[PDB]
Symmetry: D2
Subunit: 317 residues, 4 copies
């Protein structure tokens, strides 16, 4: 039969016999995502242009408010906020959420695909809630995923049961399950990085990309795609296979992408989908964060592709 | 004051004192575009998935455009990416314009939900002969109007005409195109370069060289960022908004490029030139090319003028 | 072949070879109506209720602003404004528009169908446009109709060429031509009036209604329907046939409905559709207004039904 | 704090500490209602008119399929289907659902308000599920309500915690709690019935209505309203108070409205709001049904108004 996101989550939660909190958080998040989708598609823009006589802030406000009021959260970390948000005592629940409410928005002016990326942890320590509760390795993720506001809006949700993709049907405002237990290709034909940083690349990265353009065994070169918007680039990587890279430009040394709410969620999605995600040195999901907005290098995608890069990384030691 | 596409056009048309065919054609088109936009954002998909118990998007999009154009009484010859021959409008529906269009550009990668778009170029039919394929064989210089609908984070229609380039945001709450950016002009020089670097092994050495200088400037300037969506409407629209350069050039394996002249290159070239940008094949302005085939390919390097002029410096260097 | 409101009006205007000014007005009002529909259906209500942490006024503002900026109007009469709005000289066109922007909205609280009613005249005096340009008998109407915000949104447009009905497809925000050159049934099976005012009725109304319930020719009695929203009641009258009545009572001794922006447009639509519209004493469209918020009584509908009523009104002298 | 239907119900569900089945059911019903609303507002109608070159049926399909696939139901009664639908064993839950998927659909061609009515029971026998399970008096209702597709879409949900009203925001496809624990007025000023069938009225109904229009004291008559679609008339009755009647007579000894999926749900909502619902002889919720499609007379609304009706009824019995 047809399924929706909310119902899919309920049936999985009923199965697991949990208290409903995660389902409440997820339903709340999905309401925020639909409100973000609507704003992003410029619903009501006419009224802003005088018909009757901020988007990242709005999106942040939407997710913060939906999550605070879900009663399922205690600590909230956002790209938009300098410090962690500690939910008021009355609204505290057992989950910690790290999110980027509108990823890729700094270039929304060219109507590039944007998205919301999120990572859900259970609060691990019994101490009073604090920024420290978001400082868990990605391995500790209970659920993660993203809404892509692309040609269409899709919510990708990763949990222990696997990766499932839900398309927003805007006619009824419902997320419809369209891809079940998603697995990424073992190897793709596309590579994805900002090559304008060629000048700064590792010997490892440079040689790997070199192999994609000029394969040693005369095979067809990988095609190149780089939207410049992480959720868009990562989604294609899931759907089509291949590799996405945002390495340290030795000139911006800890990577550019944020660990808690960009790298981890996607690494989690990748791994649940049979993919891999590395910093080069260790699994993304194994980094023990010390800071909520800390950055990481990230290379992710099909396992044969990522493995191929790690072989190159290791030749260069 | 608020303005909309239809009403922007009607006003421009009354100032021009025309008969109304172009306004009628353009209103038909933007209706098709709102239908394509609704389809692309997957309205009604729940019903494909059995909520209550067929045409691909590029096909539906072609039928939307063809139908609304044929029924506009403003067109006589229609060239589409989807159709082998030019469609000749039936005598009772014939009007004065020839429209060349790609109904869903970038469609082959619509599965990853990358931005897609509709590209159109509108010509006045130039002779009184019985309409045929030849009516579409005009250089881009002859365009009366051109542009694109980009189905991205939001849907935007960009219309180029003699009065310049105007950007219209689709408000899906009311299905109106709202004028948001007027008389748009591109930056003289940008900081972004756009092409598929994966096929570098097939590059023309001048392309190889130009792109190297973007990544390794011999002058202490910051290197250019790279962006490549792989969707022409998306890539060209970023190029318009932020400046810089977009390349789909010729090589040995493809001496005439990959992109189609009539309904991909010419409309984008026209928008670009109206915006103070440039569009070249390497050998001449894309708008100066005389087509001999409606599905004729051309190379296209377009964008900010200083960037395009710089590519031409290197291109010449390789003869 | 498919048609839309805007393109319908364009080809009609093209045929009449006019200056496009009427088309421009109608397209602007079209846009206002879609904006009104969206607000009536409560798009964005979540924002009012705190998701991110007056309808009749808005409707007036939408109609006012779009018509002013159409460059096609000079005088604007609304149920919402005590006086005619005189368009600033830079925006003046040749048409007078009388409209009720959200007819039936005092009861919008129960989700009753509401509507927008409009009538369009050519201005009269080469002088200043003035409140007096709106003071024309309905017979002088260039165009009239309504948008009904019912179970679906429909725009009914009456002009010289007849009455045409357009359904708003909310998926693409376009008015689709669904009913061409509509003609009302010669006689219906439904009557429509507020019978709560029975105690106040003149004897003619009393006898006519009594005939609908207790037919003298022993035929089937007429059904009763009264939404209490003129647009809804008149639309049903148009589609199904029958009769709509708003006669005089003690609280409303010259009727309750406003001549300029309720009765005339509906009368004009009725007449163009082969129905009738009388005040009892005369054709609604023959009444010369002396005030812009002047009230008139109205009996309208299928020709036989309205004739039958006039013959009873005739009897009671 | 903003609240949504699904979250409100989840929160009430977690408070009751139930298994989640009712929440699952109500969420699935909620989705079908959104799909009904979209179809009813005519989304996609441009495609029926050849832009690219049912409603009662579709609504029935939507509700049935959403309910079957919910894993919450065992027996489904629809106005549309003679026999109860017995859900397959692999899809079986504990609830019996009685519904009218599109009330007032006959008169959808004039775009007047339509609605969806539902009543939800717990299966009480340990027998194999069968029609007999739907044969419970309204007093056994676990939940009941309706969606009205009027000028906006609203879902009214009555449960043991009372009556809550949720507006659909079409921009995001969410039911937003807008009226909490609603209570009906003790006495209203409107009466609602088809007065075109006066010749066939019960003498008690004739007298009651005569009293509303010509009150024996000097006092002001009631207004009359009759949309002719039960959901619209009952909802106005809920919002503004007064009385709705679809009573019995000698030609219709059991009235014409359906007990299980019309009268019961509205009686339940009415009673939970502090109003009354009667057949004249007993409470609607007290009738033991012997047939899933049986009719009941129904008089409902403000208690003072129903009480006054019943005093007249007792004068003629
Ligand atoms: C995969 C998953 C999802 C949710 C959960 S959960 O939140 O901890 N539990 C839970 O939802 N329980 C329910 N009971 C009744 C309903 Br309806 S939902 C656990 C695992
Ligand atoms: C820039 C431009 C656009 C359209 C045209 S057009 O189609 O040839 N003319 C035209 O529309 N004239 C009108 N008449 C009345 C109305 Br309303 S619009 C010309 C120039
Ligand atoms: C029935 C009717 C409608 C409009 C008019 S009108 O406004 O006075 N003229 C007019 O529209 N002319 C045009 N022709 C082509 C276009 Br595009 S617009 C007249 C009659
Ligand atoms: C008023 C009412 C509503 C629902 C129910 S219910 O369905 O039987 N229980 C239930 O939902 N329990 C939940 N637990 C966790 C979640 Br999320 S939902 C009971 C009472």
């Amino acid at each position: 039969d047809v399924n929706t996101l909310t119902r899919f989550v309920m049936e999985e939660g009923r199965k697991a016999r949990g208290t409903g909190e995660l389902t409440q958080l997820l339903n709340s998040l999905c309401t925020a995502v639909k409100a973000i989708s609507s704003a992003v598609r410029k619903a009501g823009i006419a009224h802003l242009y005088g018909i009757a006589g901020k988007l990242d802030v709005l999106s942040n406000d939407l997710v913060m408010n939906m999550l605070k009021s879900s009663f399922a959260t205690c600590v909230l970390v956002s790209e938009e906020d300098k410090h962690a948000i500690i939910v008021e005592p009355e609204k505290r629940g057992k989950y910690v959420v790290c999110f980027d409410p509108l990823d890729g928005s700094s270039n929304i002016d060219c109507l590039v695909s944007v998205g919301t990326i999120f990572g859900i942890y259970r609060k691990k320590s019994t101490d009073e809630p604090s920024e420290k509760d978001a400082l868990q390795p990605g391995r500790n993720l209970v659920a993660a995923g993203y809404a892509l506001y692309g040609s269409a809006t899709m919510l990708v949700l990763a949990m222990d049961c696997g990766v499932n993709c839900f398309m927003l049907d805007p006619a009824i405002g419902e997320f419809i399950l369209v891809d079940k237990d998603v697995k990424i290709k073992k190897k793709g034909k596309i590579y994805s990085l900002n090559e304008g940083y060629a000048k700064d690349f590792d010997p490892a990265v440079t040689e790997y990309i070199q192999r994609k353009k000029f394969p040693p065994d005369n095979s067809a070169p990988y095609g190149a795609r780089y939207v410049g918007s992480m959720v868009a680039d990562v989604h294609r990587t899931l759907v089509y296979g291949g590799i996405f890279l945002y390495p340290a430009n030795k000139k911006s040394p800890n990577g550019k992408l944020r660990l808690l709410y960009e790298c981890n969620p996607m690494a989690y999605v990748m791994e649940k989908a049979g993919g891999m995600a590395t910093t080069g040195k260790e699994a993304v999901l194994d980094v023990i964060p010390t800071d909520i907005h800390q950055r990481a290098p990230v290379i992710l995608g099909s396992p044969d592709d990522v493995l191929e890069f790690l072989k190159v990384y290791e030749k260069h030691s």
